[PDB]
Amino acid sequence: NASASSGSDQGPSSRQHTMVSFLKPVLKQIIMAGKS
Amino acid sequence: REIITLQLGQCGNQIGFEFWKQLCAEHGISPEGIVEEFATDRKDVFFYQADDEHYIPRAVLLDLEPRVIHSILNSPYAKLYNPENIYLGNNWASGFSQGEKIHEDIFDIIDREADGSDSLEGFVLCHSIAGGTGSGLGSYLLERLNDRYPKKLVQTYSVFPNQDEDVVVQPYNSLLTLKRLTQNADCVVVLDNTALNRIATDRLHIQNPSFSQINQLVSTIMSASTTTLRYPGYMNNDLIGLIASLIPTPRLHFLMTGYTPLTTDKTTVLDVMRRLLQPKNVMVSTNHCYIAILNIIQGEVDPTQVHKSLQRIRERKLANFIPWGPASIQVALSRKSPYLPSAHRVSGLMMANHTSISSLFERTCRQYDKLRKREAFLEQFRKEDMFKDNFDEMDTSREIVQQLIDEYHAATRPDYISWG
Amino acid sequence: NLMQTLKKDYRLVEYLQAMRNFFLMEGGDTMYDFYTSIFDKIREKETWQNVSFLNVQLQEAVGQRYPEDSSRLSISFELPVHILDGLTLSYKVPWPVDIVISLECQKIYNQVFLLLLQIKWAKYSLDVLLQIHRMFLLRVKLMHFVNSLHNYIMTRILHSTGLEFQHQVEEAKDLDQLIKIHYRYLSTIHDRCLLREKVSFVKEAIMKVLNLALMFADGWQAGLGTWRMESIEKMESDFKNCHMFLVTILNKAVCRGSFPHLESLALSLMA
Amino acid sequence: LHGLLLDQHEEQFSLRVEILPSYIPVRVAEKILFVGESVQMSILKNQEDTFAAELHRLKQQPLFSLVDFEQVVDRIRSTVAEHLWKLMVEESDLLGQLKIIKDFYLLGRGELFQAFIDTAQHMLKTPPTAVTEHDVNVAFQQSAHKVLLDDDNLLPLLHLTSGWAALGLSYKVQWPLHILFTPAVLEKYNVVFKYLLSVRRVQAELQHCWALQMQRKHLKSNQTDAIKWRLRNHMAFLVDNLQYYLQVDVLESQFSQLLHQINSTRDFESIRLAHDHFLSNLLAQSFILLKPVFHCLNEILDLCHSFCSLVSQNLGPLDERGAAQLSILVKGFSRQSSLLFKILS
């Protein structure tokens, strides 16, 4: 969170923001490779 | 909770030695206590667990004037039994007096094993009645453990000596031991030297080396009497739960023995249980009646036939009993072990409460009464006399054991709801 | 890549085991050498907050190969007893390991560090300590209680918990779960030590009976007879009744609260 | 083949008979469903594209023949119908897990459910689940730790809804792992466990109440027939003891036939019949199926418990007006043992 290489707090959201369907299961994996 | 065996006296140590060896072979244990490579059992209760799989039994071996305990030491299994708990006359008084001086250290030995154990249920004594050194000391120790452990229980695998009647003071010694046992021992499983010797003549031609061979018979009985505890089951997963059925009144706590294949070296359950009731398979030498009967069977037992077998036994009525107690005979089942021979694939045992053993008690009281009128063997050794000038606990024992005899016969009577 | 990088290059297991041993969690002998000097009353300023002196003592007591990134320089905060809070110790962690050692959690570590040095201070003060014989008795009626509290906090809670944390972070395989487990481990030490939830109900009792020890050793010095202390009965009654309050407070936990953590120490042997 | 739920939108889940085409028979449709259910829970993946290949040919031919469709469905059945049983018996250790059930659920272990009661007797008071609830599971795992028996064992959890009245156990067997064990089935299982714990607890009480041999008559004559409880303890012991023998024969026989049927047959649907007949016989034969016999027996148990309560408090042999309580108990026990002749009828 403090290490917000991915500001997912301001990225995906149910209403304010949006998330593509096909990629839903793999979110945190993408972020983890990202935080590196 | 774990059981500790207080084997004492030369004879008691011989039978405890053989019993622990038999459970070494039966369980996955080598003569060094190591877990056997070739090896499902509850080894908690009888065998303490070392870190490197030394299954050392909770044996407390007591020696007095040691001769055969040196032979016990120079054995392959000395490493098996190493709690390091050995601490150094033919008269009951002499044994009692010798026990009194060392009572604290042997009791600290008791304490330590209790302490190593997670928890403690029972003290199982390989006691010898009129065993010279064994008797007197066993009676004193029996008097001590119960005060120190009021909640805890004492069982006694008493090898009652009948040898067709050498020690001249046997009735006196046995009388005093029976007073202490009748009042201070919780359970007693009675065995008879003549009964086992007669069986020895029957099954084999052995007559002269009776003691050495009869050890095996005693060991088989002692092991099979515990097999239901040593191996898991649905019922009788504790000694105390088993004992409750066998002893219906506190005074009458002496238990008769039996085994279907005395020649254990397929047979249906209907066959095996009845052989126990046969006088031949029984191992003990006015109407008379059982108070309660129990049978444990180990082998390839079909399950649906066991209840039908109980019904069939009810039809044959081979066992006659009309006691005050309502306890009916019951078919219980245990696990025969692997790695040992399966000869006589099905094999069973009986523990029963029977009024006949009052006869065997009365025989030694008869010998004692005759000897008492004669005063032929008062011993009168200074040990005997200064220990016992009044000579009156023998009378106290006589009245207590006479109460026991009368109580047995009152149990035979229809009205044991009233006085025993 | 994360876990290996943070263990072979910017060593995380070592940075954390440092954060435990010879640092805030576990004193060892280094922190004994550090603490005795600051306790010493000779040439001691009123609050002894000289940062150069404090830092010099820490570098004398580094006692390891990596004698770096430890200051003890944070400005002490400006008290029924002396009860000097402050002394804050902040450890500098680089970026590749910072993600799991947050500047936020540093406060929690500091909070428990302060309690550890108060309890060492109390036991050490009554150690530095030693009608005229009755004082010797009251010393004993006090040392048992403080030492038992010290026994519980120092070993039962922090050591035992730190052992499964050390073991379980080996199994853990995620950058986020490694944060979550670490936060659980801090939230459980900080709770099992009586430092959250009810404070007036529990904590102030131990604080005030610690304060009585602190006065008892502050009003005494070694080697004379004429203390002229007539308050010994007042302090006897005070310690007695505050102890009654403490044990009853702990016994109230039976109805509600953290029974595993409290009923272990509520068996303080009373008298 | 792949197991996808809701391959399409509408028009676990089960047959939709109204929309089935007439020419496809209901029986082959039932054959389809079990195949579908299997994949969710294999060598189907190994020979996956092969079975997709024959299905693709059935796509290719112009006109539809039920005779050929059956052959493909049956080929997938011989590799799913019995291949779910393949994954249950060998890969999911069905036989092994049934052992764990009886051992830790139906009191099939002596150690874990005897030392547990010995070291958890204190939870006899009515609990609000505040403290005792945690303490009982703590006691369970501590009990297990006495002699080995320390491998997995994470899953078993005791729960409190009269300290010993409610001790309901819950085992975490997942639906993707085992469809055989269901909520109602584990519930029916739970009713059985509570019942059998009742008999075990009372008979533990009676063996402990056999304390006259232990201490009162032990070195002390005291008074016999002036101060005795009539030794009714042992007739009372017989009633509960023989009920336990009743449980032993029922359980051991049913479990033997269940695991020999399982070894013999090869279709999971039949295995399910075998097991639902196992539990169904266990209920009625043990009498837990609600009955007047059970109500009378529970009254015996409560009268059995009160007698233990009387003998507990007395300590030294004395009649602190104990005769009144004993009179009520002896009379009631005789009365209800007479009701136990309804079984003889």
Curated annotation (Swiss-Prot), chain B:
Signal peptide: none annotated. SMART domains: Tubulin (SM00864), Tubulin_C (SM00865). It is linked to Cortical dysplasia, complex, with other brain malformations 4: A disorder of aberrant neuronal migration and disturbed axonal guidance. Clinical features include early-onset seizures, microcephaly, spastic tetraplegia, and various malformations of cortical development, such as agyria, posterior or frontal pachygyria, thick cortex, and subcortical band heterotopia and thin corpus callosum in some patients. GTP binds at A130, G131, G132, T133, G134, S135, G136. One of its GO terms (molecular function) is structural constituent of cytoskeleton. GO terms for biological process: cytoplasmic microtubule organization; meiotic spindle organization; microtubule cytoskeleton organization; microtubule nucleation; mitotic cell cycle; mitotic sister chromatid segregation; mitotic spindle organization. Component of the gamma-tubulin ring complex (gTuRC) consisting of TUBGCP2, TUBGCP3, TUBGCP4, TUBGCP5 and TUBGCP6 and gamma-tubulin TUBG1 or TUBG2. TUBGCP2, TUBGCP3, TUBGCP4, TUBGCP5 and TUBGCP6 assemble in a 5:5:2:1:1 stoichiometry; each is associated with a gamma-tubulin, thereby arranging 14 gamma-tubulins in a helical manner. Gamma-tubulin at the first position is blocked by TUBGCP3 at the last position, allowing 13 protafilaments to grow into a microtubule. Belongs to the tubulin family. Tubulin is the major constituent of microtubules, protein filaments consisting of alpha- and beta-tubulin heterodimers. Gamma-tubulin is a key component of the gamma-tubulin ring complex (gTuRC) which mediates microtubule nucleation. The gTuRC regulates the minus-end nucleation of alpha-beta tubulin heterodimers that grow into microtubule protafilaments, a critical step in centrosome duplication and spindle formation. The gene is TUBG1.
Swiss-Prot record, chain C:
This is Gamma-tubulin complex component 5. The lineage of its organism: Eukaryota, Metazoa, Chordata, Craniata, Vertebrata. Component of the gamma-tubulin ring complex (gTuRC) which mediates microtubule nucleation. The gTuRC regulates the minus-end nucleation of alpha-beta tubulin heterodimers that grow into microtubule protafilaments, a critical step in centrosome duplication and spindle formation. It is found in: Cytoplasm, Cytoskeleton, Microtubule organizing center, Centrosome. It comes from the Eukaryota. The gene is TUBGCP5. Belongs to the TUBGCP family. Component of the gamma-tubulin ring complex (gTuRC) consisting of TUBGCP2, TUBGCP3, TUBGCP4, TUBGCP5 and TUBGCP6 and gamma-tubulin TUBG1 or TUBG2. TUBGCP2, TUBGCP3, TUBGCP4, TUBGCP5 and TUBGCP6 assemble in a 5:5:2:1:1 stoichiometry; each is associated with a gamma-tubulin, thereby arranging 14 gamma-tubulins in a helical manner. Gamma-tubulin at the first position is blocked by TUBGCP3 at the last position, allowing 13 protafilaments to grow into a microtubule. Widely expressed, with highest levels in heart and skeletal muscle and moderate levels in brain. It comes from Homo sapiens (Human).
From Swiss-Prot, chain D:
The keyword Cytoplasm applies. Keywords: Cytoplasm, Cytoskeleton, Intellectual disability, Microtubule, Primary microcephaly. It is found in: Cytoplasm, Cytoskeleton, Microtubule organizing center, Centrosome. It comes from the Eukaryota. GO terms for biological process: cytoplasmic microtubule organization; meiotic cell cycle; microtubule nucleation; mitotic cell cycle; protein-containing complex assembly; spindle assembly. One of its GO terms (cellular component) is gamma-tubulin ring complex. GO terms for molecular function: gamma-tubulin binding; structural constituent of cytoskeleton. The keyword Isomerase does not apply. Ubiquitously expressed. It is linked to Microcephaly and chorioretinopathy, autosomal recessive, 3: A disorder characterized by congenital microcephaly and chorioretinal dysplasia associated with poor vision and nystagmus. Variable ocular anomalies include microphthalmia, retinal folding, retinal detachment, optic nerve hypoplasia, absence of retinal vessels, round areas of chorioretinal atrophy, and attenuated electroretinogram. Most patients have mild developmental delay and mild learning difficulties. Component of the gamma-tubulin ring complex (gTuRC) which mediates microtubule nucleation. The gTuRC regulates the minus-end nucleation of alpha-beta tubulin heterodimers that grow into microtubule protafilaments, a critical step in centrosome duplication and spindle formation. Belongs to the TUBGCP family. This is Gamma-tubulin complex component 4. It comes from Homo sapiens (Human). The chain holds residues 192 to 631 of 667 of the full protein.
